[PDB]
Every structure is written in C-alpha cells, then in structure tokens.
Design a protein around this ligand. Structure first.
Ligand SMILES: [Cl-]
Ligand SMILES: [Fe+3]
Ligand SMILES: [Fe+3]
Ligand SMILES: [Mg+2]
Ligand SMILES: [Mg+2]
Lengths: 151, 145
C-alpha cells in the first residue's frame, strides 16, 4: 500500500495541466497571427488567448494551495508538443483535450480532498466548454466560406 | 465549382484514412484496458461500428467516382483522455464534411455521414461521462498496489 501515490498523481496532473495551458497559449497566439479573412474566428481565438492567460494565473493559485510548483521541463516540453478548415478542427480538438483533462482533474481533486480548488477547476473547464461549443458551431460556416472562396 | 468538389473529395479521402487510424487505435486500446470491463466492452462495440464506418465511406467514395488515397491511408487515464480526443476529432471532421457535402451537392451522402457522426457523438459522450470513474478507479489502484 501507499496512499501517498494518489497525491503524487494529483500533483503530477496539476503540473500537466499547467504545461497544457502553456501549450494552449502558444497555439492560440500562433493561430491568431496567421488567420486572415476570417474575422469572427480570429477574434474568438484572440479572446480565448486572453482567457487562457488568466487560466494559467488560476492554475498557479491551485499549485500554491497544494505547496507545489510548475514543472519547467513539462512547460517546455508541452510548448514543443486546406489550412483554415484543418486549423479550426485542430483548435476544437485541443479544447476537447482540455475538457477531458479538467474533467479528470475534478475527480482527482475530489479524491485527494482538495475541495477548495474544485470551483477554480470548474471555472476553467466552463471556459473550455464555451470555446469548444463556439468552434463546433462555426466550423460549418468556416467550411462554407472556404469552399465559396475556392471557386 | 470543380475546386469545391475537389476539396470535398479530398476530405472524403481524409475521412477514410482517419477511420483506418481509428480502427488501429481502437484495437490497440481494447488490448490495454485491464480494469474497466465496461469501458473495454464499449471500445469493442465501437471498433465494430468503425469497421462498418469504413465500408460506408467506401460506398460514398464509389458513388463519387473517387478512390481512397493510398499514401494518406498507409496510463489508463491518459488513454481514456486520448480516446475521447480522437472521437472529438472525428466529430469535428464529420461536422465539416457535412457542410462540404451540402455545399458540393452530394446530398445523397448526408444521411450516411449524419449516421457516422451520431455514432462518434455517442462514443465521445460515453467516454467523458466515464472519465471520472476511470480516474477514481486508477487512483484507488495506485494506492492498493
Ligand atoms: Cl470568421
Ligand atoms: Fe482552451
Ligand atoms: Fe469513433
Ligand atoms: Mg486552457
Ligand atoms: Mg469513426
């Protein structure tokens, strides 16, 4: 037996989530800088970048509550880890990764007893769901625009 | 209108390559799930669904007079997350493919693509609904072992 293995897993996933948000922040900045001629899509990506910068700040508060720090290695490795249509699809898929990871993290925080952090995790998760919903709603419009312009 | 139809054809070929990736991923996942009978069973049911999705895409390819692209074709917590993300990639790709089929006027294929999309949505749903249980099970095991 070692009960402390559960807490080690929780702390590892908190560090994973922090690294994931660094990856998101890089991805969103890159996408925004590259998009031309899709004003709504670009602006929503720019808004989510702002949201993601705050998600990092919020995760750092959770790390602090648990008396741990980010992994600099993981933060760095996560930053190493047709186009408008494919890129929209890619963006959606990354938000769904975030959704899955935060859903798992809610269960982990519950298991660990870190009740005080659950409403922050929920706040983040709700922002990812809102972004994923926006994107999947706009994918058909984007696909139509792309096809119209291909002619 | 030829460029639009070509894009739609390219994306049909992309979807067919994707479903071969899925078939491979599902088999590999079924073999690695050792502590969630209900999850492995869901995955096995989806693998069967996926083999049929490939046959349906093959009918759509034929009806559009195209062929698959040869070149394009050829732990448990992180695994469940990865499976979910792959179903979500399929959801996003079929959401786009539906819009493309409507634009290109391959209206005949809409019901088959919609059927595929609803399968993917059901699998994604099962997965996220059960990620909390998978996580709890994993954590308990990590202590017990
Ligand atoms: Cl737009
Ligand atoms: Fe996000
Ligand atoms: Fe699937
Ligand atoms: Mg995020
Ligand atoms: Mg599929």
């Amino acid at each position: 037996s070692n009960a402390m293995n559960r807490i080690e897993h929780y702390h590892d996933w908190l560090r994973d989530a922090h690294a994931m948000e660094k990856q998101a922040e890089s991805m969103l900045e890159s996408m925004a800088s590259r998009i031309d001629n899709y004003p709504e899509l670009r602006a929503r990506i720019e808004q989510h970048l702002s949201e993601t910068k705050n998600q990092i700040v919020q995760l750092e508060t959770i790390l602090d509550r648990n008396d741990i720090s980010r992994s600099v290695i993981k933060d760095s490795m996560s930053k190493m880890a047709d186009e408008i249509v494919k890129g929209s699809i890619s963006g959606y898929v990354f938000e769904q990764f975030e959704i899955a990871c935060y859903t798992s993290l809610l269960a982990a925080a519950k298991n660990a007893g870190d009740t005080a952090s659950i409403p922050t995790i929920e706040a983040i998760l709700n922002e990812e769901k809102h972004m994923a919903d926006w994107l999947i709603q706009h994918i058909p419009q984007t696909t139509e625009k792309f096809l119209i312009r291909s002619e």
